[PDB]
Symmetry: none
């Protein structure tokens, strides 16, 4: 395969390195100029379990994707809010049969991706590998992991299984799963409850859990996610998903943490990903005729809070 790695951070660098080592033709694409320049001049340097390895991986600044060959596969490691811009910047690499594998754990990315490749050529996945970015052009590659992925498109299960096999040839331990839609929805329920509620109430997850109405608010939101998912033939186990959301309240695990959205807005004074979480459910709700008032309101509140902080 000719593969483009759209987002050459720690995980993209792992995938790019592993795929390159097995004889694939890889292009790294990244927005961090010092990262790009270091890798151009000296290759990607990695501590791999833990041997010092180098690889001269092709790399381009995402804004300078002019002359490169078109690719068979794009693997996406770009945050939701940067995804459409990345795709716009790299669209010259897309040929008719180019497949896209998303490893972004979020809902509705397909709708952006669909503008650039047909649904039949889009695959969604989760990665359980770890990776660390030590400095520009410098990665440390931890230990063990796996990839699970699924076709979007209808009738593309066989194609998804070949894609998995191909990634597995590079040691990525990839597998087909028909459970990826489900797991993305389940994770989004956590992201659609803890993030917005903590951000608006100014509490960590444990303190949210100590409130008298947290269970009601979480349950109501999860039911909205589930109504929308049911339209897409995904039947969430609502009680389990609610319990999974509420497991974040445990101060012994992650409860004392303030969630990523709180870090973005309250700490970093940056715009939140709310439109890609509760907003995505609101958008589907409008399309499907499904009421999502808590997702609507929470989204509206978080935007108001952003505005109030001049973010």
């Amino acid at each position: 395969m000719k593969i483009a790695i759209a987002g050459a951070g720690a995980m993209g660098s792992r995938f790019g390195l592993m795929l390159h080592q097995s004889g694939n033709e890889v292009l790294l694409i990244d927005g961090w100029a010092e990262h790009v320049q270091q890798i151009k001049e000296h290759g990607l340097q990695a501590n791999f379990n833990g041997k010092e390895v180098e690889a001269k991986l092709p790399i381009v600044l995402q804004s300078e994707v002019e002359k490169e060959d078109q690719v068979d596969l794009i693997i996406l490691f770009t945050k939701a809010m940067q995804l459409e811009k990345m795709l716009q910047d790299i669209q010259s690499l897309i040929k008719k049969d180019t497949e896209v594998l998303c490893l972004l754990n979020g809902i509705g990315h397909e709708d952006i991706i669909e503008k650039f490749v047909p649904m039949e050529n889009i695959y969604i996945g989760n990665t359980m590998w770890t990776a660390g970015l030590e400095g520009p052009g410098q990665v440390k590659l931890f230990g063990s992991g796996s990839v699970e992925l699924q076709n979007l498109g209808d009738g593309k299960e066989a194609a998804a299984k070949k894609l998995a096999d191909k990634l597995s040839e590079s040691g990525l331990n990839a597998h087909f799963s028909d459970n990826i839609h489900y797991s993305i929805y389940r994770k989004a329920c956590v992201n659609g409850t803890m993030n917005g509620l903590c951000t608006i109430l100014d509490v960590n997850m444990a303190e949210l859990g100590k409130t008298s109405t947290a269970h009601k608010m979480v349950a109501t939101i999860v039911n909205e996610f589930a109504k929308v998912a049911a339209v897409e033939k995904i039947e969430l186990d609502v009680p389990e998903v609610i319990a999974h959301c509420e497991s974040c309240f445990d101060p012994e695990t992650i409860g004392l943490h303030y969630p990523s959205m709180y870090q973005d807005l309250i700490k970093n004074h940056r715009l939140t990903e709310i439109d890609y979480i509760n907003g995505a459910i609101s958008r589907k709700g409008k399309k499907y005729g499904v009421a999502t008032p808590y997702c609507d309101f929470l989204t509206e509140l978080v935007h108001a809070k952003e505005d109030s902080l001049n973010v």
Copy 2:
């Protein structure tokens, strides 16, 4: 009339005194023990206009009404959060034909009151009188004022007009108005938007108005109020009511002010009246089969914020 004044604070004391002077039989009911005892021993003392007057008004602690005669009329001067308890405590004074006049400026009180008297006997009003409570059993009463009131039960306009006449005989300058119920809903829309949103977002009203979504949030909430009001035969002009809510955003007038709910919770670390504003709309919504998710959620959020501040 035999009249009970349920809440003998400054305004209740004015009404009680004025009603007494004109030959009505009045019973004051209050929860402030020192207030009750002072009036028992020395009567109610008032600086009227501005003569030092007194009246040996019957008065009972609210939990101690079992010796008293049943009454023809109860006039309520009790805050929302104390209303159901007051009614529970005084319910032995209620006979079949007892009328209740609420001078609490809020929405949904009728649903609490309805547990004790039928809707046909409930009246709602506003008072524009002033009154000051100087100390236990001591009031100062100055200047002029008026009362406007309305029947809640169908076909009770004539009864409301007589009630107004009766209060006017005691100098209270009372009048029937058919616009009280509407104006109470319109005011509650303001109280159901500015209060909760400012409290949760930590903003004054002007800062709320500067946000991109304030209009949507206000509009959605007002529509919930209006859907519930329509079931009760009150047809709000939604665009006007929305504009009225949004007039609070003006920094040149009231915008720089933090609303009362924000003062209660964020400043005074006290429980809010949220259950008697958005909560009242949520309760009616459940009863009427009308979805009120923003009122539900805002109520839930304000309670969570109370809890997070250890206000419980």
